[PDB]
């Protein structure tokens, strides 16, 4: 059956304060002798969680500032630097003040991915002006994934399959009953599952059909690969009052050197992690195949790069060096930050992540991949 699962948990986007207090010691009842037929690819819990995450993202953005005024022609020069590195543009514009009959000449550092050139060669505009309306994310609500336990109502139950080697579907012996799922962090990302739950026995390959290319191959790691980010720019913020009781937090001067952001992955671990992955893939594809790993074929920035949210800033890491081997000391992946983010593949609901002050760092754990085979 399918029901409305509610949340349970121990200033956040996913409204975790509103959740029911979870049981300090969850009660798990190992059911004996019972075999149940699972199917992870027709799970209604997944679609319901997708709807819940989208709804929470929408409700967190409801009371925040609307940056409709910010869509104007911007006189952009390069940030003061010697050096490509056009990655930051010092853009000046006439913003509306608290008084409707006055205007102020203000400036802001905008990433190059957030501004497109119009026409006069110095005139720019935000990327979203010709497709969407932009809503500044509130500076006080955090994007940090807090674990969420999905509990079913009374009269329903959740069946956890404890079988370590779970292909994903079909009959699973050693079933158990739980009142809530484990803490599932809502971590949005592409090309790599971060801060996830790990397999216990082996690396696990799970695809709806391993013959259909359109179906992604979810890889789960038995051991995590630690990934360390830094946004080395200091990036102070600055409030510009765009209207009565409405502020716009814009990047000001950078305190230090203009350095490319990145995330590092250990080479000796990521190799032999791909070793386990190629062993488990050769299980499905025969022993004589040559399991090559190439980088992203193309598409949007959200799927050509390992996209994610780190320290409140939205990173897009190249990961061309990760997915490099034939398979018969760190790997610095350069990442680009964006502030105009269109989550959930939508249009009309873009948002402006305010600039974070200081220096951001990730310490995440790659616990899987989302691969795609070439036909």
């Amino acid at each position: 059956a399918e029901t409305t699962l509610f949340c349970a948990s121990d200033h956040n986007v996913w409204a975790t304060h509103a959740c029911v207090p979870t049981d300090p010691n969850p009660q798990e009842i190992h059911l004996e002798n019972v075999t149940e037929e699972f199917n992870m690819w027709k799970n209604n819990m997944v679609e319901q969680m997708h709807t819940d995450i989208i709804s929470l993202w929408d409700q967190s953005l409801k009371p925040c500032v609307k940056l409709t005024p910010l869509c104007v022609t911007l006189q952009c020069t390069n940030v003061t630097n010697n050096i490509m590195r056009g990655e930051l543009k010092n853009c000046s514009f006439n913003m509306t003040t608290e008084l409707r009959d006055k205007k102020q000449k203000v400036y802001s550092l905008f990433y190059r991915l957030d501004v497109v050139q119009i026409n006069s060669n110095k005139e720019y505009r935000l990327i979203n002006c010709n497709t969407s309306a932009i809503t500044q994310a509130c500076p006080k609500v955090s994007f940090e994934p807090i674990p969420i336990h999905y509990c079913a109502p009374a009269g329903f139950a959740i069946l956890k399959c404890k079988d370590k080697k779970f292909n994903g579907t079909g009959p699973c012996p050693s079933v158990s009953t739980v009142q809530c799922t484990h803490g599932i962090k809502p971590v949005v990302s592409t090309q790599l599952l971060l801060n996830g739950s790990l397999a216990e026995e082996e690396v696990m390959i799970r695809s709806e059909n391993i013959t259909n290319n359109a179906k992604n191959i979810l890889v789960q790691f038995n051991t995590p690969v630690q990934i360390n980010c830094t946004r080395p720019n200091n990036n102070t913020r600055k409030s510009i009052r765009i209207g009565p009781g409405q502020a716009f937090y814009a990047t000001g001067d950078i305190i230090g050197d203009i350095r490319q952001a990145h995330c590092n992955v250990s080479k000796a671990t990521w190799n032999e992690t791909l070793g386990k992955v190629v062993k488990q893939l050769r299980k499905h594809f025969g022993n004589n195949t040559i399991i090559r790993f190439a980088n992203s074929s193309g598409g949007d920035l959200e799927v050509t790069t390992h996209s994610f949210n780190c320290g409140g800033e939205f990173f897009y890491c190249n990961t061309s060096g990760l997915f490099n081997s034939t398979w018969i000391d760190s790997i610095t992946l350069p990442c680009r930050i964006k502030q105009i983010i269109n989550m959930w593949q939508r249009i009309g609901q873009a948002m402006y992540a305010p600039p974070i002050q200081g220096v951001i760092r990730c310490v995440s754990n790659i616990t899987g991949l989302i691969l795609t085979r070439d036909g």
Partner: antibody, heavy 132, light 106 residues
Framework: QVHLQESGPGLVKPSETLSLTCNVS????????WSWIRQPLGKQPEWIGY???????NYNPSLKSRVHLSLDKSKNLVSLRLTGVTAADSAIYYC??????????????????????????WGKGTSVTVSS | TFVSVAPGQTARITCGEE??????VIWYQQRPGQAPSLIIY??????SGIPDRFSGSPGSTFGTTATLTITSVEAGDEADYYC????????????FGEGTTLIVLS
């Protein structure tokens, strides 16, 4: 002990190619970098350019299009031939053994560094003046 | 600038503009009547023969001007003091800084 002795005419006609040379002893011209430094009287020194044999040659952008530096091994000389001489070029010209160093402030793979050139032991100086 | 310090005191000679990024300022001393000479490169590293009294402000700080501190000033230290700033966030500076004539009251 590296000894540098710069030789010049001492006076040059305006709109005529001034020329200088830097006799070197104790070191070979091919080994290290070589820079020239033009100090106008009563003003700060100016870095007019540096020359090397591997291909590293760079001159001041203001003095560019009128300057040329050459390294002659046969006589151990550094020749600076500043065409288009004008009134402001009156100055004391020095010759120096530039030494380079890399200041690294980030990831070297991302070219987050730069080469700073510090001038080791200089010469003495030739006070070239321009007048009719 | 004509910062005058009696001998045996500590003299502070500042030069250049406000720091923007990672900087490697090179200090030069010009005694009156001779060619310049090197003191510090990479903000604190002196070649052989230069005394340890010469010290430079770190280039790792942003928003601080380059300074040269000279402890126990002597008549030898009587000279003009130039600075060759190599900032990461500025183009190459092809002219030295405005020199400061340190005057020893001896």
């Amino acid at each position: 002990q590296v000894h540098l002795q710069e030789s010049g005419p001492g006076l040059v006609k305006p709109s005529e190619t001034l020329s200088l040379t830097c006799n070197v002893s104790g070191t070979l011209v091919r080994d290290n970098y070589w820079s020239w430094i033009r100090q106008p009287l009563g003003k700060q020194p100016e870095w007019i350019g540096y020359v090397h044999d591997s291909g590293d040659t760079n001159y001041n952008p203001s003095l560019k299009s009128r300057v040329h530096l050459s390294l002659d091994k046969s006589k151990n000389l550094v020749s600076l031939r500043l065409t288009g001489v004008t009134a402001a070029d009156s100055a004391i010209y020095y010759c120096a053994t530039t030494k380079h160093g890399r200041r690294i402030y980030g990831v070297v793979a991302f070219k987050e560094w730069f080469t700073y050139f510090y001038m080791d032991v200089w010469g003495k100086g030739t006070s070239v003046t321009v007048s009719s | 600038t004509f910062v005058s310090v009696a001998p045996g005191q500590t003299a502070r000679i500042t030069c250049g503009e406000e720091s923007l990024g990672s900087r490697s300022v090179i200090w030069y001393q010009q005694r009156p009547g001779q060619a310049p000479s090197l003191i510090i490169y990479n903000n604190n590293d002196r070649p052989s023969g230069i005394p340890d009294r010469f010290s430079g402000s770190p280039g790792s700080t942003f928003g601080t001007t380059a300074t040269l501190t000279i402890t126990s000033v002597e008549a030898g230290d009587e000279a003009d003091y130039y600075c060759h700033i190599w900032d990461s966030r500025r183009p190459t500076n092809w002219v030295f800084g405005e020199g400061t004539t340190l005057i020893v009251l001896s």
